[PDB]
Amino acid sequence: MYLRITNIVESSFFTKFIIYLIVLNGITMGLETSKTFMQSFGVYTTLFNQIVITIFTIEIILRIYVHRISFFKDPWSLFDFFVVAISLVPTSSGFEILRVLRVLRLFRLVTAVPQMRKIVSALISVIPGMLSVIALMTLFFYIFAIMATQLFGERFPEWFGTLGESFYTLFQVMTLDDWSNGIVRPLMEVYPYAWVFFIPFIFVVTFVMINLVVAICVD
Amino acid sequence: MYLRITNIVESSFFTKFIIYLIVLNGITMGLETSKTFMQSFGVYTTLFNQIVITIFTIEIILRIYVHRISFFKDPWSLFDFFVVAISLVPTSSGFEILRVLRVLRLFRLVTAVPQMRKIVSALISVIPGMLSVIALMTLFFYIFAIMATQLFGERFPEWFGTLGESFYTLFQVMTLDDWSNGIVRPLMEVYPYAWVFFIPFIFVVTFVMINLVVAICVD
Amino acid sequence: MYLRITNIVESSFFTKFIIYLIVLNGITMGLETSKTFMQSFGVYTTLFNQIVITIFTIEIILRIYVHRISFFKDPWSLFDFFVVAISLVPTSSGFEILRVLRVLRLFRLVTAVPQMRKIVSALISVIPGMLSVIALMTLFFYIFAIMATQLFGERFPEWFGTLGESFYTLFQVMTLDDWSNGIVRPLMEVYPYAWVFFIPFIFVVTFVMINLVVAICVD
Amino acid sequence: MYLRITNIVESSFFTKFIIYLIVLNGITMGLETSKTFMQSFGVYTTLFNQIVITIFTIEIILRIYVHRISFFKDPWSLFDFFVVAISLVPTSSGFEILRVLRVLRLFRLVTAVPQMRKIVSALISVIPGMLSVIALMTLFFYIFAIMATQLFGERFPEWFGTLGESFYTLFQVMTLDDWSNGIVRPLMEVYPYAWVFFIPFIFVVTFVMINLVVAICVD
Ligand SMILES: [Ca+2]
Ligand SMILES: [Ca+2]
Ligand SMILES: [Ca+2]
Numbered sequence A, B, C, D: 001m002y003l004r005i006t007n008i009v010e011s012s013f014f015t016k017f018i019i020y021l022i023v024l025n026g027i028t029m030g031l032e033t034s035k036t037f038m039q040s041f042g043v044y045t046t047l048f049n050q051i052v053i054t055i056f057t058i059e060i061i062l063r064i065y066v067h068r069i070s071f072f073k074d075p076w077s078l079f080d081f082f083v084v085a086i087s088l089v090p091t092s093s094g095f096e097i098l099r100v101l102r103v104l105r106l107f108r109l110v111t112a113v114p115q116m117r118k119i120v121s122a123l124i125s126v127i128p129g130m131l132s133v134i135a136l137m138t139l140f141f142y143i144f145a146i147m148a149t150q151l152f153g154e155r156f157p158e159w160f161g162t163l164g165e166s167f168y169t170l171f172q173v174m175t176l177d178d179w180s181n182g183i184v185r186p187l188m189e190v191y192p193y194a195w196v197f198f199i200p201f202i203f204v205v206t207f208v209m210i211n212l213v214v215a216i217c218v219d
């Protein structure tokens, strides 16, 4: 019976039947957004949802016999596994992000369809070459996040009052979002020299960021 | 009579006469902006407008005899047909954007002059090699846009209340426009963890965009 | 006497003397900023200024005899002419920008010291290959600017009320500066679909600019 | 005894021991942020802190016998010296940023661990090739900084009232942060033409910046 199902699993029909369901459950997840629609056909789509969820566990079950160990060394398969597992946690208890995390299954459209996998893989592959930079920056953030917390966090606890808070604010300065009128012009009303902290911070972080982009256009 | 007009249409005089009208109507459209001007010479330039619009239909009519099916497979020609047709719809009824969309005819200065044609084409050609990235993103946007609507849309209906609104807000976060003091700091007053949703969103979306820029700087 | 002064002008000492003055008059111009400083040495500097201005007219007079027509075909020299010329208009009558435009003479530090000339020329040389794009864009801005004046200028006359106003607002949207909370969210409170105008605008204009960056990074 | 210690200093165990303390003292500094933690184990940490600071001086002392002059010609060694030196100035007196500047020792993780040194060096090496442009720009900022102080500083002293202030505001316009609604639209309410100063400013500065990015993506 092994080869019987191994022929079902590897079938073009099977994979295309899956891709057909993702597009249906996705279209249907956009509809669950409408408070109007849920009042009409909510029950329609709640069942349809649970239906697809079963089909998806069946597939993942079927897919596992055919591949066994090979399956748990496949990124795309591991994913699919975890994205359905999430979709299995009972519509109750614990946290309700799990209810919301269910929409992550539409990323199976990324998994089930090549070229997407290609493009995704293409992107991801660029990350290891960046890890030296990324490491560098996080040390840098961490160092400044600490200084800022202990330099501005007393008078300005919304923005720098906590280590995590400083992280957030520093990220925001880095994205250059309302950084001057929003954060630093205020700070200087109390700490005239704060510009001495943030302009060097900005150069460095934008510089590094420019290099990183340049590194991705070398490789 | 065919070759007679085929020698009128293909003539340098004809083309340069058309180009002369575009720059003229275009100048006249900048003038129709002034409430002062319209109070003095508005009559002058409405008639001038109808005149050029005739001339352009006459031309487009002529151009079709000389090319027939060759014409409705020309991107640039199809355009002018459409753009002139818009300018034909009666200054009345339906909507008024049809009155406003008339100014689109000044894009004929792009159509009727090479180098422009070249430059535009150079740009457009870059698009197909982006469709794999672009597709990826729209899946991504759609996914998060749904998540956001069900996570933040009840308390924050102006921003995330409806799917389309989440799209709009997510776009804005992506252009990095006032994203922290404008949207996420507010969000955190109610949902402390909202940063867990938007910082990852930012990295991904900005990363992908960096890749796409690098992709265009390879090909 | 021609070769006597052709040996004075072309002298290393002559040039290095000029360069010495630029740095001095520049230093002295940063000091005329202080209302404090002007109250104690204001006169010291006003005369020092008039002095250097003569020395510069003398040089330009000298430089012209040694070069005649060769001079008025030199970008860098023409510059210093027009720049020194500005500084000759009397501290009175007309406009007072002319008084302010005097500090443009510090650009002579660029003109009279090589390597700067290199980099400046390096930069400038890139412009011709952008003229097709720069033209393309200005046509684009112009068409949208007209559309916006007639679509939003009645309710929103500060931002779109005049052809020039629309230009400015459009520029700002393009630099992506406070474009959504600042301009488009307001607009949508009256014109729900305004997003149909501004999102495509952003794509095109940002796209084009990505290409322009890619174009420069090829040539 | 020289070669005895030269074999101590050059030992892998030595370097690794140093790297251990950095990560430990660095972990300790993140905790020194917590107002809670300090009440609990603040003392525990301040002693451990001074301990590490002792150890680090010993190392730097040792490191010098083994390298002498070779050391004070090493960028990375000079740093470690200058950084440990900062941490040596007593917890009292003068400026208390010195207490804060202590956390700069976590940059020793950059110093003691290669790959980091590599990446830093990679970044730093790009700088010399930018000095012509950076010089160009600072002259540019300086000239505009002066014009602005004398053009807008009377009515708008917060933003332009002083040379340094103009510097700050101009930097902010350059980062394109809230530049239009935050600064120039205001300006224009009084000085209608301020746009003639700031749009050209923006073009130039953004142009130059794009060149510098491309310039790096070549070398
Ligand atoms: Ca920005
Ligand atoms: Ca704001
Ligand atoms: Ca901004």
Ligand SMILES: [Ca+2]
Residues within 6 Å of the ligand: A178, B177, B178, C177, C178, D177, D178
């Ligand atoms: Ca803003």
Ligand SMILES: [Ca+2]
Residues within 6 Å of the ligand: none
């Ligand atoms: Ca505000």
